[PDB]
Symmetry: D3
Subunit: 323 residues, 6 copies
């Protein structure tokens, strides 16, 4: 076989040190994200709606304005759903695509479909507009540090379409945009010209964000193939706490508790899991109280904890990429 597609089982982080942490924390503006990155996404955006187009556009526009050589690829495809065949459009933003190994961050940008009620619309603030914004802010706050990319490894952002079901959650009505990109990736030579290494083999770890934005989340540690990376999150959250770099945060209310989760949760990682991609599944258990109700809006987001998680994740990424 090829030498490099093992490089990840042994990859270790460049732990940052207090001077570094203080700057990463300095370099994220929850307020900037909240008005520049997230408020434009708090619209109805089910697949095929005009809001899917708006959101797609907004995401690329806010990436393009950055300096790093982000290579965007809209992957409009078709797939079968209750109401017939329909058009979806995953958004993929990659740095150094030539490269063999990528750390991937991901969420879904579609919003579940709901019939208007009481003249209220479902905009899906935790599920999953915040995660979209968190990934945009991360691309910004770290634009400079991420210029340094031109260890052959880099960063990819995936914003899946069609995470949600049109009707009722089932394996056949769900994960439209993930089930499709898993397969396409699984079947693409990587690097170009290989003859045994697919594009998953370059997927070092899939950090999937989902249902984030409520207060007092608890994130379980879901899979052992990635639990060492979960512990970094705990550590990163601890040190960021003892430096006074977090807001309204308590160690008695940490976000990353070493509580293991035997059971399963269906989500855009399965298509990549079952094919043995290592996964960090940053979805909370229990889900936000407002889950799948019209009350999942901006008013019920907690600024402080989106800010704390932003700071943690950005460190985790610089630490994974050695930056």
């Amino acid at each position: 076989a090829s030498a490099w597609p093992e490089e990840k089982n042994y990859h270790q982080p460049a732990i940052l040190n207090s001077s570094a942490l203080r700057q990463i924390a300095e370099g994220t503006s929850i307020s900037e994200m909240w008005q520049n990155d997230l408020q434009p996404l708090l619209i109805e955006r089910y697949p095929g709606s005009p809001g899917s187009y708006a959101a797609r556009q907004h995401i690329m526009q806010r990436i393009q304005r950055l300096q790093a050589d982000w290579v965007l690829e809209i992957d409009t495809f078709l797939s079968q759903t209750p109401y017939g065949y329909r058009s979806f459009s995953n958004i993929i933003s990659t740095l150094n695509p030539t490269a063999k190994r990528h750390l991937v961050l991901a969420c879904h940008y579609d919003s579940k479909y709901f019939s208007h009620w009481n003249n209220r619309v479902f905009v899906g603030a935790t599920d999953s507009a915040v995660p979209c914004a968190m990934m945009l802010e991360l691309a910004r706050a770290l634009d400079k540090k991420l210029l340094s990319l031109k260890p052959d490894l880099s960063l990819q952002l995936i914003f899946f379409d069609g995470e949600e079901a049109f009707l009722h959650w089932s394996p056949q009505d769900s994960l439209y945009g993930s089930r499709h990109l898993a397969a396409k990736m699984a079947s693409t030579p990587h690097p170009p010209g290989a003859r045994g290494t697919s594009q998953l083999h370059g997927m070092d770890l899939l950090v999937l964000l989902d249902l984030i934005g409520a207060p007092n989340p608890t994130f379980p540690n879901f899979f052992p193939n990635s639990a060492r990376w979960f512990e970094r999150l705990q550590a990163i959250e601890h040190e960021l706490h003892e430096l006074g770099l977090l807001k309204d945060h308590s160690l008695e209310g940490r976000y990353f508790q070493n509580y293991s989760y035997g059971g399963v949760i269906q989500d855009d990682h399965i298509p990549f899991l079952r094919r043995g991609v290592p996964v960090l599944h940053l979805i909370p258990s229990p889900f936000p109280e407002v889950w799948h109700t019209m009350d999942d809006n901006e008013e019920n987001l907690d600024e402080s904890t989106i800010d704390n998680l932003n700071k943690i994740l950005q460190v985790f990424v610089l630490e994974y990429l050695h930056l």
Copy 2:
């Protein structure tokens, strides 16, 4: 699509108030149930046995003697099992079947098959004769309040046959009566003449009872699509406690702890789950100590906690139906 089959995502309860609670509690006789409803069911009743006929008869007889317009329907069908094709008979008791939306309570009335041992027979007192009786007592205690039904919503009772395996638990040997009614329902126009709304779309929530009757149960909160309804149970159990309306009950031993359950349990809800029916799964974890042994009899039932749960469930129902 049709307007009404969303009515349940937004349905909220008519919380009862202390004068109301005191009467619901006054209006259940654990002793009446135990001699009139449950003792006749503590017989061997595997599918096709004479005890299946006895139990079927007993259930209808005890319903018919009530005043509300309970419409009974025995749904004798056939399905394949290890030992060949066999005859099963789900029992379905419905109020206002014309109506579009139903809250459904359910258990299984078959008893697992066991070869007599030491001249002892398996009668399955927790699994699941008690749940049968709990649903009969609920129909009685609330007969009057349930006359008021002639918000288009009502109550259905399902007593599945063939929950248990004949040989060894497997997806192919199990859930005979549920796998069959799920499908039949899924394919029945509701309301009559519709052209897109099946009979599940009228299944507002499936409250499935199973393995109840032992002391000191703990019921986990299994699915988020129904966790708000689980919290009502906690609340209802709390208020009923602080009013002195419970027996031998301790808040340090509540039955409904906010302990989440990642993994899965196979049971008559799966056929209705996988098709996206919201489920409250009132089965305890851990299972009774006597589970699937000849020691699951009447002597090892705890009167007090069947009484406490009876009282809680009846409130939950009046609260769900606004009565």
Copy 3:
């Protein structure tokens, strides 16, 4: 097992004799059928269309006007299709349903869906309005002889809905009304109270008619489990020829040639085949020239050969039922 559900492997016909043949032939009016039974069905009648309702009504109305105790049952159900869940309605007309054994005749009354072209509509005259009419005329011509039913065996007519695909022929888009009645039957005790005999076990033979009405058909002999019954058709066609009871008919152009067919054809019999129901599949090979074009209309039907087949089938039925 039960004794009787073998009765069919050994069932033999009461061959009719020239005086009898001459009367059956006397007793069918191709002209009556063509104006009373078939012309009302030459309308667009895809599932859910108003023409499905018209056709459904017309079929029952023309049965009800007969004397025999035809027991009609409309079996409106729901099932999943490309464009979503939809409503279908099989029509079932039975004589002596109490009885254990039935010879079943069947076709499909839906018409394939097509977008109007050149202001032309698909009415599906061979596929399958003629077979519908042929089964109505058979019920009429033999009304008297079929009064004699009150060997426990009788006659059933099935007119399936949703034979055709909405989009493109596939196992998932096809046979909506057959796949559903096969299963329901397979799971229904027969006789009522049995405990091992489904309702297929009473399905002695399924004579399925399809794509009939063109000139010069050739019907292959498809399955050995029913080839003895195919030979009766040949014989019945021969004797009816040598008696001068056929029109524009030639033995060098017989309809039932002992030409075997190795391959397979998908059609409403599969759901009943794969469950081991014996099948006579009266569909021609090759299909009419006009198959699935707007040219499959009334002008391109051949009166003479619909008349010849009508006469043959009616004999076959009286011969199978001993009448």
Copy 4:
């Protein structure tokens, strides 16, 4: 739905007339094809071999030298086989890809893998190097007539890789390059921006060539969804015969006999069939005598009948495209 993806059920040919036939026949050089198009392909070319690269290159080179705006696309992908994951490369040559409707010709360019025997190699002259060449010659002979394309319909050539099994014929070891392009096509918006029309909907008819080059072939008529197009082939073969435009040809030995084929043959059309693409399957029954032996070489090809079929197919194409 969209109007145009029905355009094919009603599409009819522009029959050519004797002056036209004489020129198409004049315009094909069996000798040119045999030295310029086919002899370079009579090499071992299993997937991944150097001969796969040679053949791939040769095919594109011989297309590029033409005048029409052939748009080539090599679709290197990966898929699982007995011996592991491996790299395949379908070749796709399209004219007017912008357009909505395409008539597609196709064969496979891989050669079955065989361990050298007696110092002999399998080069697969009928299976399927000849069909490759026949499609190249067709692109040449008709280059001029095919310039006229800039009824929105055009022509596509597909040369699948991995038709053959590596080990033993099975659904899991076969059709690597077809099973993959069917799916990718099925999921691609066509035209770009559509939201219900895949790229199959533009696949008007799939004319698949395979196992051609032996003498005295007989081609059955496999599917009714395309039998009208098979009859054109018969007609085209007849008229070309009665004009003296064929060599060593006899009507008592026609190639296209109205002999129907009930059973099935597995081949690159299945992936496109099961998804309802209309298919003309030009594979003979029986297969060449030399099938899958080292004797399937150039010495055992019959020039005359490759020439006759070349002439017929080219007419069929001009007739389908109205040229």
Copy 5:
């Protein structure tokens, strides 16, 4: 891979010559077989019956009395059927099992189960007691010639149990003894110690006999992977005819007509086919007139054609083994 498991694609026969044919024909006694080999098998012998034991015993006893080093192996196993799990017992008789390559002859020795009718029992003379006897006589007539085995190739006899369905033909109720030996073989190192060659790889060709014993059979040529071997049968039948070595035989009624069979027949070869074992399927099309009726007895066998086929098959075997 290993060199030898290709040896069969290129294996060719040692055609016998008139002096040889005359002796093979001299050396078979239809009368001996009919009283010594077949009459003991004309008993009810469904799986688990006492007749299965009788037949099993009879088969081994009649082999053991021979001189060649026949190594018998009864492969009693269990598998699931309608009426539950049941015990089957394939019989396997092998010469030179150490060896890598085997020509395999096979039939099934179970008889379909039928409830006695008119005090008549199903003994399955063509289906398949005759084929059993034909394989025993072949072992005898050629005992001497088959001593010569101690080209590493030899002969195996398989008599499957449970070919027939207990209830109704289906993929789940059928081929119990074949589906099981296919798998076991597929997973057994051959030769012992190999690490890639299963025991199928030593299965050079599977000659499966079934439904033989009626007059005027016609055997189609089913698969091209074995059609060269079918032609040997034609040839062998021709030469044996023109030598006056056949009885009541006519070339206008040959048994092996070059009539191809597109469709499929389910039978003990499928388990070995789908895994790419080359198959000669000696079952007639059409099936005997008496197929699956109580009339499939000894009185309706035709001595002459069992004798003619015996002679042909024995030649085919000596010709395949070079003896």
Copy 6:
């Protein structure tokens, strides 16, 4: 059905008493095991490697030197994997195989395959060489007590091959040696001559050991069909603690906590679970810190806790067998 294959639902232990415990504890030498049983297994031993042969040999050699009538059976088979078909070899050591009921202990002796890194090899000390040794020591320490076997019940050891995936964990790449022995067992008459009792029916309980050897394990209680047996382990661990028979052990750090595990873990028990075999799954949750890294070696094993578990398991076995 047969009487005895229920004997296990009611089987209860012969609890040992302090004099007995002290001797079992006296009779295990962690030091002997560690040099005689385990150190020879700390080699690279993926399937087909020379180390698989070494380990296979070592296991049998160390059994054969014992006195009890251990009947060894190497079950070399073949099965499909990413890189092709490959050869595996389960090791099975049985006492009193004639007998109907067996308590089975098991682990896997293969080691996951890894490409050498930093000149380091994966030897899989917890996963699962220690469990191998623990089962050998158990056979030794109890050799004498296990002579007493000549309640028809005995002990079986299974050392599966191919537990691990070659590439990435999936249902298709995993459990090669278990998926194969489950099936073979499921289909073997037991006792020999039975006709309904497979060899699973003699599998009283499957105690599967895996990932053992690290400090401070926590073993959850996975299935209720075996939770009574898990409680024995707790009890046995408690009493062994309060007798001073354990080392470096704390009740605040017990190994068997009554912590239930809702979710699932894939492992050699599934093939036997899904077929309803009762399972005690002694794998810890969480997995060792060194899981699937080169750091899972001998240096990071904790002598004390392997010793404590050895002592506990040996008691559990004598207690299950009444010795």
